[PDB]
Subunit: 180 residues, 3 copies
């Protein structure tokens, strides 16, 4: 039933190993799964962009504290949030609070606003020209977003794992990025 | 749609900053939110009453243990539940178990019993004369309960925060209640 | 309404102390409760069987690690999973991952497959002859499964509690099984 939905493309086609959509799956279940997948993909895309920017030597100009702790002095990766040399716990809690405010008020599907598909948070408020695209281009953009999100999920998991296995003696000369 | 419901009164009117009810919000969502708000308000009202009674020097007569630990020897506030001089862990676990029994059996909206609104746990079992009040008086009582609950939420949050910031050097001469 | 459902047997009859099905309880709520009860019963039956087999001196032949840690060297009970002499954390995490894979993909009620009642995971895939039984025998088998599951819930709780109270000085010469 969902073998022709978004995300079922070449070369794998419809790829449902664990069988979430097996049987007479309801549209609500697939909508929930696609919402979770798109949310994870967007978060992972942002996380991968952040690690790429930070690890390349690009840091915000200034100090993260009144104490003078410069932005470009903190480590990259999980060591920047959780560790002995991480950013202050106040900064992490404020970041989490901002993300929670976004979750509750901003990055949500408001019913009866004009949203067209799962993951559309536009809400008739912030539109950059979605209606300019025709249907085929719209589907292509949605598929690109979803697949880049899956790739970012895998990449961010790999980056965190590789950073975490370095103290254990598992230091890998990763391609392109190099040593973490 | 919910701008004329209970709790939207002077001077703020309908106050929905985070936009929980924005858009075509369903009645189920508002009922869930109002249930959570009323439950929190009742819990916080009881918590503030407990704070006032305990901090005023009124303690239960006797001892909380067979070992002879008197009721009036334990501290007030968070130090009475979680701390080195708190009540015995068995007492806290029994309190939590009693509250869970209440949650699962007593303080619940039993369907098909005669409940009139969200937060009405009466269940046609314990009534002190609710039907004696007229509709306007009923609405006034419900609004009083809700607003006192919100005030108690903020007050209990303030009391816990002020108790917790005292060891950090943030001791404030609070009005009325004084030093915690 | 649910006083004649499965699980209401002599001598207790319909036993609903906490009043979970009191009032106009929907079939969905009873179905959820029965699903949870059957799942817990099956898990507890497996846990009791495994703990009895392990405590009887029957262990898998070989070693659980490449390091040579034999199966019959680990303790019995909670000390085998969580403790200073437990199985390796890798083994526990892999067991949890296998159970999660089962939860997600295998031990589930796939809609539109032919399942006849709550707790039926057969899904028209693995059938040993369920249709051979008549209606009364089917009800008897389901009731036996449910009641043995409740008995196993109590038994596994008792086994874990008795194992945990031994270091505290509460060592009980339990009947049949003896000292844990
Ligand atoms: C998962 C996302 C994520 C997370 C958790 C972090 C976390 C962190 N970043 Mg970071 N970053 C990210 C994405 C992320 N970043 C992206 C995508 C970029 C590229 C622009 C950067 C660029 C960046 C720089 C240049 C620096 C950091 C730094 C830091 C650290 C200090 C916090 C700070 O100043 O943030 C700053 C965050 C930003 C500048 C960009 C955040 C953008 C977010 C993800 C937007 C997402 C919500 C957005 C409002 C949605 C808009 C919707 C639209 C319709 C309006 C902290 C560990 C600093 C550091 O290393 O100090 C220790 C630092 O110097 N980051
Ligand atoms: C558990 C906490 C809690 C919850 C769930 C609610 C829930 C609600 N409040 Mg409320 N409120 C609370 C605490 C809470 N309140 C406290 C402590 C105060 C005192 C400052 C108020 C003061 C208040 C006013 C003055 C009004 C509401 C209103 C509302 C309703 C819609 C507004 C909204 O976006 O929700 C509140 C926000 C959240 C749930 C987001 C929480 C994110 C963290 C909703 C039923 C409005 C209403 O009843 O209109 C019909 C309204 O006018 N509230
Ligand atoms: C959030 C609610 C709450 C919580 C968590 C606590 C927690 C505590 N209180 Mg306390 N207390 C509360 C509310 C609360 N109280 C209220 C509202 C009052 C005013 C009557 C008191 C009066 C009070 C005294 C006088 C003493 C305590 C003490 C204590 C401590 C020991 C436990 C004990 O003996 O409880 C005793 C609890 C009570 C005497 C009253 C509890 C009543 C609860 C809130 C009823 C709520 C559910 C109820 C069944 C609903 C009925 C619905 C109706 C339709 C039937 C413990 C830290 C003792 C202490 O400090 O020793 C260490 C102590 O001496 N409390
Ligand atoms: C995971 C544990 C669990 C769960 C979810 C249930 C769930 C249920 N049991 Mg049950 N039961 C259990 C363990 C459990 N049982 C055990 C261990 C025993 C043996 C002591 C029993 C013995 C038992 C009897 C004798 C009866 C039930 C009945 C019921 C049903 C309604 C009674 C009720 O309020 O629920 C049970 C209570 C809770 C879920 C509250 C838990 C709060 C902590 C419901 C499907 C009745 C039934 O099937 O009627 C149709 C019935 O007559 N149960
Ligand atoms: C709650 C269930 C449960 C749990 C958590 C454990 C946990 C454990 N068992 Mg164990 N065991 C169980 C049930 C369980 N067992 C049952 C039911 C039996 C009887 C066959 C055994 C027999 C057994 C032996 C003989 C040994 C262990 C050992 C161990 C320990 C090492 C892990 C291992 O080798 O597993 C091995 C697990 C098994 C041999 C059987 C597990 C079978 C599971 C329960 C199947 C459940 C799902 C299944 C696929 C459903 C199929 C449905 C069907 C339609 C296809 C570990 C603490 C070993 C030990 O103590 O070394 C430290 C050991 O030597 N167990
Ligand atoms: C004005 C304003 O405020 O906002 C607007 C601005 C604008 C532009 C309109 C908006 C937008 C669009 C945005 C932000 C789009 C972002 C898209 C983004 C960020 C897309 C890539 C993600 C990451 C991927 C694919 C990672 C793959 C990672 C992969 C495939 C790996 O496995 C990788 C790997 O590393 C390992 C682990 C090991 C090494 O071998 C190295 C490599 C690399 C191989 C917003 C959102 O509307 C907000
Ligand atoms: C027979 C039996 O068993 O039961 C029946 C008995 C009976 C009577 C019928 C029943 C009832 C009704 C009850 C229990 C009603 C209770 C109502 C209650 C308990 C109502 C106030 C709450 C707290 C508020 C408003 C706090 C505000 C706190 C505020 C506004 C603050 O911010 C405060 C502040 O402190 C700071 C943090 C700093 C300092 O500057 C000091 C102050 C104070 C300014 C029940 C429930 O049906 C059960
Ligand atoms: C081919 C393949 O791969 O799979 C198939 C194989 C097969 C056979 C078809 C299948 C099956 C059926 C199975 C596995 C059925 C299992 C049934 C099972 C395991 C049934 C008892 C549970 C435990 C009870 C009742 C415990 C009570 C415990 C009680 C009553 C206590 O309180 C006890 C106690 O200890 C205390 C705490 C203290 C002491 O005084 C000692 C005692 C004992 C008194 C499956 C599932 O379809 C999978
Ligand atoms: C996530 C987004 C975000 C938002 C929306 C946001 C809003 C506000 C507002 C509201 C207008 C104020 C008034 C405010 C004030 C301060 N912020 Mg924010 N802040 C955010 C993020 C961070 C991070 C990451 C850090 C940080 C800090 C500080 C410090 C320094 C305190 C000090 O130096 O003792 C002060 C005074 C740093 C800190 O925590 O220092 C321990 C630091 O690391 N903030 N901040
Ligand atoms: C929340 C409500 C509540 C209920 C409904 C409830 C019911 C019962 C019943 C059932 C009829 C019994 C039989 C019972 C028995 C004991 N209770 Mg309760 N008890 C409640 C609350 C507390 C608190 C707060 C404490 C406490 C204690 C004890 C001790 C002392 C043990 C000891 O001194 O070794 C014993 C023997 C104290 C304790 O935990 O001491 C470590 C203590 O702090 N109990 N209790
Ligand atoms: C729950 C079911 C389950 C499944 C489905 C499953 C699948 C696979 C697969 C996939 C085909 C591989 C390739 C694989 C391989 C290894 N397993 Mg499994 N394994 C399961 C259970 C356990 C347990 C309980 C233990 C264990 C272990 C090891 C070790 C030893 C590593 C070492 O000696 O360093 C290796 C190499 C032991 C261990 O973790 O040792 C620290 C141990 O305790 N495994 N295992």
């Amino acid at each position: 039933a969902f073998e022709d939905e978004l995300g079922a493309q070449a070369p794998l086609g419809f790829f449902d190993p664990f069988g979430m959509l097996s049987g007479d799956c309801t549209q609500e279940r697939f909508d929930r799964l696609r919402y979770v997948e798109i949310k994870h993909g967007r978060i992972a895309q942002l996380a991968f962009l952040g690690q790429v920017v930070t690890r390349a030597g690009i840091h915000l100009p200034g100090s993260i504290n009144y104490a003078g702790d410069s932005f470009d002095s903190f480590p990259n990766g999980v060591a920047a949030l959780f560790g002995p040399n991480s950013i202050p716990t106040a900064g992490l809690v404020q970041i989490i609070s901002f993300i929670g405010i976004l979750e509750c008020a901003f990055m949500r599907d408001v019913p009866g606003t004009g949203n067209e598909h799962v993951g559309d948070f536009r809400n008739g408020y912030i539109d950059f020209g979605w209606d300019e695209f025709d249907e085929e281009t719209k589907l292509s953009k949605r598929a690109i977003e979803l697949n880049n999100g899956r790739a970012a999920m895998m990449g961010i998991l790999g980056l965190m794992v590789h950073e975490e296995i370095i103290p254990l003696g598992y230091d890998a000369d990763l391609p392109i990025i190099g040593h973490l």
